[PDB]
Amino acid sequence: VNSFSGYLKLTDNVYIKNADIVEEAKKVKPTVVVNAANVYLKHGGGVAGALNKATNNAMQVESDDYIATNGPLKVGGSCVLSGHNLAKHCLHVVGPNVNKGEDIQLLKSAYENFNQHEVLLAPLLSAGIFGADPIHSLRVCVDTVRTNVYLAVFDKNLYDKLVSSFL
Ligand X SMILES: CSc1ccc(O)c(C(=O)O)c1
Query: What is the contact surface with ligand X in residues (CB under 6 A)?
Result: 20-22, 46-47, 50, 123-124, 127-128, 153-154
Q: Which residue is nearest to ligand X (CB)?
A: 128
At closest approach, how far in Å is the CB of 130 from ligand X?
Answer: 8
Backbone angles phi and psi of 101, in degrees to 5 = 80, 20
At closest approach, how far in Å is the CB of 34 from ligand X?
Answer: 11
User: Distances from the Cα of 156 to the Cαs of 17, 20, 73, in angstroms?
Assistant: 9, 10, 31
* Helix and strand element counts for the chain (H, E): 6, 7
Residue nearer to ligand X on the CB measure, 110 or 153? 153
Please give the span between the terminal C-alpha atoms of the chain, in angstroms, as a whole number: 26
At closest approach, how far in Å is the CB of 71 from ligand X?
Answer: 26
Residue type, 117: H
Residue nearer to ligand X on the CB measure, 81 or 121? 121
Residue nearer to ligand X on the CB measure, 27 or 65? 27
